[PDB]
Copies of this chain bind each other. A is one copy, B any other.
């Protein structure tokens, strides 16, 4: 469960991300594809080279969904409903990969938020991405 301090921590840190959210989402995917090459099995239809428009676009859509989730942190199942449908029924990404992207989003935030990524904020961000991941895989079966 996300405590009230976690929600405060996540809003502060994601608020700092601000306009760079989309860029950081793209970098998290790039990091995941390089560090965990099996995740590329879900994007054989994309140009995965560095800088690709398709990866930037994926990054921006994922970041906007995270912004939405942070804005609706007390009702994430509802806010992410369409995306939980999409992942469960069409994309069908193995649940294991959500932890890989989450780790790469944490590494990207760490690399871009020197001031904000304290131990407490790291823990809250980790819990938040695990919560988001749980919502996104909740309808898989």
Q: Count the A residues whose beta carbon is within 8 Å of the partner chain — how many?
A: 6
Q: Taking the full assembly, how many copies of this chain does it contain?
A: 2
A135 to B138, CA, bound (A): 14
Judged by DSSP, the binding face of A is loop
Residues from 93 to 141 in A contacting B, C-beta threshold 8 Å: 123, 127, 138-139, 141
Which residue of the partner chain B has the closest CB to A126? B141
Mark A69-97 against chain B: 1 for CB-CB distance below 8 A, else 0: 00000000000000000000000000000
Chain B CB within 8 A of A1 CB: yes
Which residue of the partner chain B has the closest CB to A138? B1
A95 to B136, CA, bound (A): 19
- A119 CB to nearest chain B CB (Å): 12
- A78 CB to nearest chain B CB (Å): 14
Which B residues are CB-close (under 8 A) to A141?
A: 123, 127
A116 to B1, CA, bound (A): 35
